[PDB]
């Protein structure tokens, strides 16, 4: 029961896979391909894909996963849906976006979220809620349709009520809450709160390549101009915590209104205090507002 696939182009390569487009035989999917010393990732993720309650257009499509033997041993295939158009980062480095690209990739971005955080279904069941815990462009896919849907679940945490103390900073430091930075957390509630900081960092780097704004400068990172391309924690703290630093909003942004509601969502959602954060609930609904 293994798939006819090919491999044709490695498109990814992260800490624990390789992603490849390949044929099916859609003629056109995704494999992510895991060594047997990163099956605790690919377990990871394959339980996220194969739960009945993620299926979501803002979330990648799942297919199955396999196990492969080859002569070095055995490999861990996640086999998807294939967005051409590439992860968000590649898209937002290759593309300046209209105002209403950005209200599509902004609102799909802000309901996938949502969805992983309920702890209920739509048709009202409860479910326990996912964090995601590495929210980056590089890890939201553009939909052809120019939606987003989220990917990369290698560090994602359900929300397990008997998850103990020892269950640190795993994730991308760049995308690191303040609170992540400072060893400063605990609430339950908390762990949404980091995607939703990092989910903002985004939210900045569709606004920064949005045309609406008039000149749109060629894309970085978050913090590009202040830490190396690889920032450690430290350098991260640094900037996030004990400079209170946020990527740039140039106030010639907020004269269109839409990139100011965006601006204004945001920067609430990168808060120092948690608290003080949206839920991505409360961002999707400000999104259909526009």
């Known amino acids: ?33 895991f060594p ?25 499509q799942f297919l ?23 992860n968000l980062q590649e898209y937002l480095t290759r593309h300046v976006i209209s105002w209403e690209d950005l209200r599509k990739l902004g609102s799909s971005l802000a309901r996938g979220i949502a969805h992983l955080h309920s702890d209920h279904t739509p048709c009202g ?39 103990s103390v020892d269950d640190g900073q795993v994730g991308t430091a760049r995308y690191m809450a303040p609170e992540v930075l400072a060893s400063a957390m605990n609430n339950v509630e908390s762990f949404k709160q980091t995607d939703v900081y990092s989910m903002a960092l985004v939210l900045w780097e569709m606004t920064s390549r949005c045309n609406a704004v ?11 101009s202040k ?23 140039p ?11 965006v601006c204004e969502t945001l920067t609430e959602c990168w808060d120092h205090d948690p608290e003080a954060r949206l839920t991505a609930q409360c961002v999707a609904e400000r999104f259909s507002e526009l």
Not at 130 to 147: A, F, Q
Not at 214 to 224: R, T
């Open 1 to 33: 029961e293994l798939l006819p696939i090919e491999l044709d182009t490695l498109v990814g390569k992260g800490r624990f896979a390789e992603v490849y487009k390949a044929k099916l035989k859609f003629e056109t999917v995704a494999v992510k391909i």
């Open 36 to 60: 047997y010393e990163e099956y605790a990732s690919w377990k990871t993720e394959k339980d996220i894909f194969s739960d009945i309650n993620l299926k979501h257009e803002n979330i990648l």
């Open 64 to 86: 199955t996963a396999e196990e492969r033997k080859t002569e070095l041993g055995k490999q861990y295939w996640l086999i998807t849906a294939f967005h051409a158009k590439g």
């Open 125 to 163: 069941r409860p479910k326990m809620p996912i964090v995601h815990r590495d929210l980056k462009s590089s890890n939201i896919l553009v939909k052809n349709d120019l939606t987003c849907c989220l990917c990369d679940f290698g560090l994602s945490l359900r929300l397990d009520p008997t998850l």
């Open 214 to 224: 008039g000149e749109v400068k060629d894309y970085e990172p978050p913090f590009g």
């Open 227 to 249: 830490v190396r391309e690889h920032p450690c924690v430290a350098s991260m703290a640094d900037n996030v915590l004990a400079d209170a630093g946020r990527p740039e909003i």
């Open 251 to 261: 106030s010639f942004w907020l004269n269109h209104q839409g990139i100011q509601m």
